[PDB]
């Protein structure tokens, strides 16, 4: 199926199943075989989500080879700092079983320790551990001065996207610095879903008979952007891969583009780090 290519040419499947918000163990292990039996070949996680070893098990069990899926993961912020960031990369390792991790990025960026944090994401992809290194809730300024102090630049960020929140500043600030943008959203475990509930998203969602969840997701892959779904129910994981037998017109993406409200729903990264040390 599809994937965007990374500025070291790295192929990043461009739909995956976010295991944010999944109970570990079985609600996880569950969670990730579905999708990897359904066809997903990305699965996208986290140090803070407490669910790696559940992930770990999903894949073992899905029986598919390790080199056939992707796997990001992130240092949570009261692991920031050169070494501390070295060592959660390894109790990360150690806990989804694997002998590289696919995606390696900063869960969030702070104000004091970011730059030192990307030093040690470096090393880990010059030693060969990682196969691609990126951030997370970056915004243009931490990206800009992030650029000053580092020897390989970012290659994802994933952030709050969706159709009332647009990021047409970022998108356009990562089209011109090479970075490939991960879309996540405060849907799947069934929040306030605002998001999903309009006239727009419902009749394209009619017209092609598929959810307005479905759209959004084909909405996102149309754009370019890489998007990761997250949910632990055996049949709406099974749902939302089931975006690449329809497209969206021209017409339908200028109506879903022009719903932005620039509505953020999440944490603002400028004043949000939870663990800061
Ligand atoms: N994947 C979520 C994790 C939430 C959290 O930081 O605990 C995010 O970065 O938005």
Redesign the pocket.
Known sequence: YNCVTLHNSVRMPQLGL?V?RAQDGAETANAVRWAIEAGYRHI?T?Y??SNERGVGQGIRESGVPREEVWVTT?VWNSDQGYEKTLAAFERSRELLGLEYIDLYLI??PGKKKFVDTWKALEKLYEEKKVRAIGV??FEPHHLTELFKSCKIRPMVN?V?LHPLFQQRTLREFCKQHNIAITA?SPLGSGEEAGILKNHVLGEIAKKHNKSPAQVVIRWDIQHGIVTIPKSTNKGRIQENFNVWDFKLTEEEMRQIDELNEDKRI??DPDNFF?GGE
């Open positions: 976010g944010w996208d986290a803070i989500y992130k869960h969030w997370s809730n994933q709050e996540w999440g944490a939870p």
